[PDB]
């Protein structure tokens with residue numbers, strides 16, 4: 001009966017994997033994931049950039065990144081407040097890179113930005129980026145606290 | 155002792171099956187499932203009727219079908235926008251059927267509806283049904299795009 | 309093969325435990341849970357207090373309890389309507405205790421409340437509590453039906 005039990009166990013585990021996969025698809029759908037599109041999610045909590053990265057990473061996701069107007073819109077609609085984006089120029093001042101690697105292609109900066117401003121007193125300039133209400137971008141200090149928005153694959 | 159190891163693993167599996175069921179109930183609850191009532195959910199995506207059916211099927215659910223005043227209002231509030239219902243007369247004009255079978259019973263038509271309007275100059279007349287923000291019903295082209303709402307058993 | 313197959317299943321089970329934990333974490337995150345803080349969830353259903361208690365228990369949570377003004381507002385924002393709180397004076401009239409045990413360490417009683425009113429005609433005085441307008445408290449009949457709001461640990 002040992003082999004029969006082992007064979008049933010494999011079947012129990014497989015059925016469980018299948019149901020968990022279904023749970024995951026249903027949750028993404030209920031959270032607004034559009035067919036074939038990447039989806040964004042937030043808990044509406046503000047925190048320094050390093051905390052957003054750590055949080056999304058814990059969720060097996062990454063800090064939200066707009067690759068085009070459509071996604072930029074989706075992120076602002078999900079965030080409903082100023083939120084960090086997975087874009088920074090910490091590695092080399094002036095050159096913005098996606099946290100997941102690579103130079104910035106699409107951009108949607110506000111007029112007169114980025115400006116690596118120091119007048120905020122949080123020490124240093126501005127090497128992180130956040131999306132404001134109207135969808136335009138601004139470089140801000142990575143120490144500032146803004147809404148955490150994580151992104152999950154299409 | 156393999157038999158002992160196997161028994162303990164079976165216990166672990168049973169615990170995970172209970173935890174996953176708990177996850178499922180908490181999620182249904184968080185998305186508004188009322189006790190002893192069917193559960194309606196949407197990702198707020200508009201799409202032709204053919205896709206709504208496909209998406210809901212992939213999630214092991216069906217296109218939302220209101221069977222009474224209670225459910226009509228519940229679905230209304232979930233969609234929050236004009237959404238398709240699982241009702242069609244595609245087969246035989248004038249004979250609206252439930253995507254899951256049977257002739258239409260409960261209905262909440264808007265004054266002058268159905269009317270199988272062809273004036274939309276798209277394709278045929280109107281063989282699908284959607285709910286307006288007012289909660290009423292209207293037959294519409296099955297190729298128009300409206301919010302996708304799926305339903306799960308009570 | 310047997311022992312090799314069994315070892316693999318231990319790995320399959322452990323992998324599933326981690327994936328389900330990740331799923332639970334993302335869901336709490338999507339339901340608004342803030343880092344290191346407890347969170348509240350509701351399906352927006354009104355029901356008698358005993359129903360609320362049994363339901364939250366089934367979800368492995370407890371009936372929502374404000375421990376401070378901060379949490380009191382949180383509950384108020386999630387419920388959006390009048391909701392029951394996990395506080396009652398059923399054991400000893402006049403002394404409200406947390407359904408989880410212990411005397412109140414924080415209260416936000418409305419003026420002229422608690423009054424253990426009998427004029428409601430449901431029978432008995434008022435031994436339960438619900439948060440009303442402005443986030444203020446009022447003792448109400450446990451027989452009355454109000455929004456179910458459950459609490460889960462930080």
Ligand SMILES: CC(=O)N[C@@H]1[C@@H](O)[C@@H](O)[C@@H](CO)O[C@H]1O
Nearest residue numbers: 113115117119126138139140141
């Ligand atoms: C939220 C925002 O845009 N903040 C910017 C700040 O980063 C800096 O550029 C400053 C220049 O004086 O202007 C501010 O408006």
Ligand SMILES: CC(=O)N[C@@H]1[C@@H](O)[C@@H](O)[C@@H](CO)O[C@H]1O
Nearest residue numbers: 264269270271280286292293294
């Ligand atoms: C949303 C809605 O009701 N659309 C209807 C359309 O289906 C068709 O019946 C047309 C004929 O006049 O009238 C419109 O108002």
Ligand SMILES: CC(=O)N[C@@H]1[C@@H](O)[C@@H](O)[C@@H](CO)O[C@H]1O
Nearest residue numbers: 421423425427434440446447448
């Ligand atoms: C919803 C509410 O506050 N109900 C209270 C009721 O509990 C009782 O105290 C009554 C006495 O007159 O006053 C009402 O305002």
Ligand SMILES: [Ca+2]
Nearest residue numbers: 090093125127
């Ligand atoms: Ca720099």
Ligand SMILES: [Ca+2]
Nearest residue numbers: 089116126127
């Ligand atoms: Ca910079």
Ligand SMILES: [Ca+2]
Nearest residue numbers: 115117138139
């Ligand atoms: Ca700036």
Ligand SMILES: [Ca+2]
Nearest residue numbers: 244247279281
């Ligand atoms: Ca027809």
Ligand SMILES: [Ca+2]
Nearest residue numbers: 243270280281
């Ligand atoms: Ca028709």
Ligand SMILES: [Ca+2]
Nearest residue numbers: 269271292293
């Ligand atoms: Ca019509």
Ligand SMILES: [Ca+2]
Nearest residue numbers: 398401433435
């Ligand atoms: Ca009493």
Ligand SMILES: [Ca+2]
Nearest residue numbers: 397424434435
């Ligand atoms: Ca009392």
Ligand SMILES: [Ca+2]
Nearest residue numbers: 423425446447
């Ligand atoms: Ca009272």
Ligand SMILES: [Cl-]
Nearest residue numbers: 126127141142
């Ligand atoms: Cl910085």
Ligand SMILES: [Cl-]
Nearest residue numbers: 434435449450
């Ligand atoms: Cl009572």
